[model samples]
Target chain A: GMDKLNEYRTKVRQLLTKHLQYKPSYGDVEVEQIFDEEHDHYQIISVGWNNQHRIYGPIMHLDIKNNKIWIQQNTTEADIALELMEMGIDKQDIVIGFHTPKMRQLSGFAVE
Target chain B: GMDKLNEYRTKVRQLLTKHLQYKPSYGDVEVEQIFDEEHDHYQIISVGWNNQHRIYGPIMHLDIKNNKIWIQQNTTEADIALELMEMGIDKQDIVIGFHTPKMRQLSGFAVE
Candidate 1:
């Protein structure tokens, strides 16, 4: 259902926004949403510095394609799939892209 | 359609194998297939040391879900979508997980 897809979009954004509220290791890091609703793409990014080194780019990313959510980049160890499932997204509708493909086979998830 | 899925699985494995043959930045890296046909998951991973640091984990990843191919990880800047399209996979059937969701919208491909 398109409604489910839209719900997924909203929930994913909410989750990412909550994640953004937590501070990163760097004092200078800025957390923000990179979202474009018309196209169904979303991400939570962090950019700044940890001491003299740079810490930048996406922290977590999710997208709606084929009416499913793809968890692309997750720098944290949190069980995002579980979170999505709690939000009523079926496990079959979520793919953990960070896992090696083979590992994901028995990962109790959609292999994709 | 199942035949197409099988063909995609085989072709993706072949492509990853070819990519593996090109060698990595480290002399000690090992490139090998991490495949499981029963669940339609596949990857090419590199492991070992690059100079002093560890160069390990997947270089490329792909999986089949809902009769579509999900391109999970591509360490290289290669246009894997174009390659898959060249191999006869429809652009709609491929999802580039690396791109930010918004960027992927106009990326002329699936955003998941």
Candidate 2:
């Protein structure tokens, strides 16, 4: 389980890091990665300003709970779960967390 | 400058980690810390839900640039700049980034 968990960590971090290249087309914002391995939460966030407009928030968020990967938030067009599966994770081990119980059930992935 | 940068990195990470105890009063969300030391960015974020209310965002965001620590976002009322000063960081070394340049000048912290 530890080995599997480590693999998930690597893949998640890698996938999040991969998206850092897609910076916001506006603002003085910075695209950043937040890999909280200590708590198993990872995110890609943008923080800064676009003229008078304040820009701050996550582009994506994920966390690992009980050794299962949870896709907590994905505002991007990318199919995060399918991307994770392509990275060698089983769909059963990946939960589409941003979805509700019924939607997760329809997702063909983990329900919890 | 490298050593100073390293010190700022440590203090930023320590301070962010220190805030993990403050969780949302009503949420299944988890308080998390994200320290991307490689990119010199760090954050404390929450990712989960309170029933139908989806909660996802950073409570705090900080980064280092040109060896200076920038407090990019602080949604809490915690006087984070003062806290960092109390942690042995010079006010000149910390930029309240969420503020405008004129505000930074008036706030007695680094203006750039």
Candidate 3:
């Protein structure tokens, strides 16, 4: 149902936005969230400069595809897949997107 | 002006989305565009797995801050700073954000 998709949408959006609360070590670094709700993609990206080095990457990336939540990239150590389940998204609806399909087969999460 | 801001927004979004045209070598890899128009940040990220290795990172990153476009990350060989300038964003209105302000000063783009 579209209602279920919207719930996944809201949950994923809010969870990704929640990652922005933590600040980086350097004052020049900025933590930002990027969302494409129309396409069901969400990411928390850090961008800025620390000395001559550039800092940029997704701190966390998620996508809702085929009515499933794909955890594409999670740099934090918080066991986010479990976090998503705690937020009411079922295990079957969650995909460990960064893992190989074979690895995901062992992960007890959705394969795709 | 608000009108100019909208122009920058559109340019950055479109440019980021256009990068998705080049497909990844691995079938599982997905190229994605993440835009936070409200925050004026944009990124093109690679996700998914190639064997056991995870493919993830920004192919290009940009932000519009202080009414200027910041080229935060450009892994591609293209001179996107010049590309943005060619797209009608003025030189002074573009920042090489990956570089330190001291280095950016020498590069002739806006330091901040």
Candidate 4:
């Protein structure tokens, strides 16, 4: 089972490494057991999207344990501002656009 | 910066928890430093895809911080059999297919 899972992860990593806007080498992943209020369930997890300085490199969280993934798209600065305020984080440290602002920074622009 | 990342993770978690094929609670995620020999760089990391008995619920690894995701489709039993042979993870404990054989076993059917 572990082998099968690793194979699946490897293929996914390989493709993303090759076809992305910028190819990446590879990363780690796992399938975790998730417990609900009433039952024990499971989900798949992977890590390779972490970047505070990479554009759109904002970390990504996906729910692939289920049949479908629902993504909330085009989050705005205003929306992020509201969320930051709610979380007690200063808005100045963060930026939001159609995607994460890491790319802009990579090209030498700083978030204001 | 961490707070924003959490916010993103949380939103993703909340939706999955609320609308799972079978709802699941939240999980953890983080961003880490990755060094490339050709170039110095980094990436994001999230772990929420581990399960030995879940359906297409195979683990997922995405390369974020790079803008875009590419997934390979229909990993067959033959693929797993080959991978297992290479990894020496034992073929019997693992089942392979367009679909994993877990559900059938869950519903009282054993692999042949």
Candidate 5:
């Protein structure tokens, strides 16, 4: 089970890394990695100019806690929760933290 | 409920901060704060030299996910779980991540 949890963390990192690599339409938009291995924290940030308005901030954020993956932030078309399920994460083990707590109740995933 | 969750996080931080202040026998064993507010991750680390040996590592680690507190690590006499309960956390809302998943089941806390 610990192995499964580790596998889940690795898969999330890999998926986020792959997701971060997809180039944005804007040539200047850059992807940044902000991962802290010791704490099981990971994030992919987007920065740089986008049509004269400086675009900056995390594009995706994830953290492994309670032996499950919490999807903290996602501003992409990639259905990460769906992708994670495909990678063998139980649907009940994922929490779309981006959703409102109340809204998350209907997400068919962990509500907290 | 969101307010309650936020209160819980605040309480955990406060308790950890208070617990971390207890002076170690060796003056060089310093307490370090390793927290990431954006990710809902918090940790109090201890580092420095003690008896000519390097004494360094996390003293405590916590993360909030799925509206519950996950105690990732604890190396102190302090009964953080009990402290948390005194702070109003429900037994089901805490996970002793340091415990094996099976052992956690017997902890009367969240298993995951």
Candidate 6:
């Protein structure tokens, strides 16, 4: 059984629901969808509406391919998640929840 | 022992179990249970189901005991947590897993 996976998701959702003021019909709504592809690298879908999307800075990734922090901005939670997942990080191990409550938080803000 | 409230309830129970859709042989379920009157504010039980109770309206709230918006929704997830525990929102903080898909999703939509 996927007990561990269930545990991880349950924990994350509970945290967000409590700390965040979710106005169901109004505010930003985030949802965890499905696994992206049938490949070795797993990517799950996280869809949401962040109408208060704003821009702040760029996102620099630790590029082993170039050995530096690749500075880029406006990355969605899903994007950062897939990137880390591809790098051999467990989805369960990744902390894709609220780290900070600042504007221009992630890349998907642009897309949103 | 408390690692930031266990990573903020494991990222809000993985963001509301992918944004709500839960069920159990109901006794009572709503946005997680609690440990009321530890004299604290954070009340976590366990996230469960949504019976689709609706009330398209507005909520006005402002003070510590002087506002509105006590409009509670259908299901959360724990209540059984402290009802399951008595000290913290850990053991039931996404600690449980779904045994099967919704009794409804068992349909032609499958890749069958």
Report every candidate's CA lDDT: 0.72, 0.85, 0.82, 0.26, 0.73, 0.26
Q: Estimate, for each residue in B10-68, the C-alpha lDDT of model 1 and write its tens digit.
A: 78878877797876754676665556565565666554455545455567767687777
Give the per-residue lDDT of model 4 (tens digit) for A47-81. 22223211122222222122112111211223423
- Tell me the spans in candidate 2 whose CA falls farther than 4 Å from its real position: A101-103
Tens digits of per-residue lDDT for model 2, B8-77: 9888888987898778789688877778776788887777778877777778888898878888888898
Who wins the TM-score comparison? 3
Chain B, candidate 3: TM-score: 0.92
Per-residue lDDT tens digits for candidate 5, residues A11-102, read 98899878876868875776756566666667776555555454555677777877888786677888889999998889988987656556
Question: Would candidate 6 be rated incorrect, acceptable, medium or high by CAPRI criteria?
Answer: incorrect
TM-score of each: 0.49, 0.87, 0.92, 0.19, 0.50, 0.18
Residue B28's C-alpha lDDT in candidate 1?
71
The complex in candidate 3 yields a DockQ of: 0.74
The superposed Cα distance between candidate 2 and the true structure at residue A96, in angstroms, equals 1.7
Proportion of the native interface contacts kept in model 3: 0.83
lDDT (Cα, tens digit) per residue for candidate 4, span B69-107: 111111222242333235433334333211233442553
- All candidates: DockQ: 0.03, 0.62, 0.74, 0.03, 0.02, 0.02
Ten-residue stretch with the least lDDT total in model 5 chain B: B47-56
Q: lDDT at A103 for candidate 2? A: 80
What's the lDDT for residue A42 in model 3? 87
lDDT by residue for model 5 over B8-99, one digit each (tens)? 77987898888777757974776755455656667675644555454545577777878889886677887888989998889888988656
lDDT by residue (tens digit), candidate 1, A38-92: 5465666564456545455567767677888877667787888999999888999
Error of 5 at B78 (Å): 1.4
Ordering by TM-score = 3, 2, 5, 1, 4, 6
How high a TM-score does candidate 2 get? 0.87
In model 2 chain B, where is the ten-residue run with the lowest total lDDT? Answer: B30-39
Question: Which CAPRI tier for candidate 3?
Answer: medium
Model 5 / residue A13 / CA error / Å: 16
Fnat, one value per model: 0.00, 0.80, 0.83, 0.00, 0.00, 0.00
Q: Which scores better on DockQ, 1 or 3?
A: 3
